[PDB]
Amino acid sequence: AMRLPDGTLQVMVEARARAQVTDYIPGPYLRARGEVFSEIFPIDEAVVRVLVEELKEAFEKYVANHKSLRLDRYQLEAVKGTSDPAMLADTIAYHATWTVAEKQEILELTDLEARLKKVLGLLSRDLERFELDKRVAQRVKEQMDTNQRESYLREQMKAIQKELGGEDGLSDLEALRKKIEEVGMPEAVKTKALKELDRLERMQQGSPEATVARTY
């Protein structure tokens, strides 16, 4: 316990075990008597330490996923000195964030292996979600590349088309290619419209297509 000058009480607590109490008074301090202290201890610790190693690997893969985000890489050095497997599992589950109802179901459960498998599945789906989100970020950068590529393509063909034809065939190419969109089109008409634009963009100042395709 240490004192803070802003008037906020600074106290550091550490839980030890849970207790089943039917009701606490409205409070404060919601006083209630504790009947039994239900907490299971690690028996047959070979399988327990196998799931502890699996939980450690899943937690490390869950942490090493935030390139564009902030998380805690150095927090795994303090959990390696923990000798109790249940304490290590609860410390792993505390530093990983999920829904409140899952935390209440973990707290209500008196089985160590069931909550170990629950935290393992939550870490697996969090690892899948974070790998998917980092692939999404990579695809955001590459989609910026591809959409700038197509935008540059369209604007450059439009620009050099206007610069060399007769203002795009007497303004009429861009007139019709924006008059395509103000009319509602069937999709085959959009494809054919691009084709009519193609037979017009092959020459808007040379062959009759500069006029017949323009009229088309």
Measuring CA to CA, how many Å separate 64 from each of 70, 76, 121, 186?
A: 11, 11, 17, 49
- AA identity, residue 145: D
* Cβ pair 185, 177 in contact under 8 A: no
The interface with a copy of itself within residues 8-47 (CB under 8 A) comprises 42-44, 46-47
The minimum distance between CB 116 and a copy of itself, in angstroms, equals: 8
Residue closer to a copy of itself by CB (options 49, 195) is: 49
Residue closer to a copy of itself by CB (options 142, 167) is: 142
For residue 49, state whether it binds a copy of itself (rule: CB under 8 A): no
The minimum distance between CB 183 and a copy of itself, in angstroms, equals: 31
For residue 54, state whether it binds a copy of itself (rule: CB under 8 A): yes
20 alpha-carbon distance from chain centroid:
37
The interface with a copy of itself within residues 136-165 (CB under 8 A) comprises 137, 140-142, 144-146, 148-149, 152-153
Which member of 35, 72, 84, 108 binds a copy of itself (CB under 8 A)?
72
Query: For binding to a copy of itself (CB under 8 A), which residues are involved?
Result: 42-44, 46-47, 50-51, 54, 66-74, 113-114, 116-117, 120-122, 124-125, 127-129, 132, 137, 140-142, 144-146, 148-149, 152-153
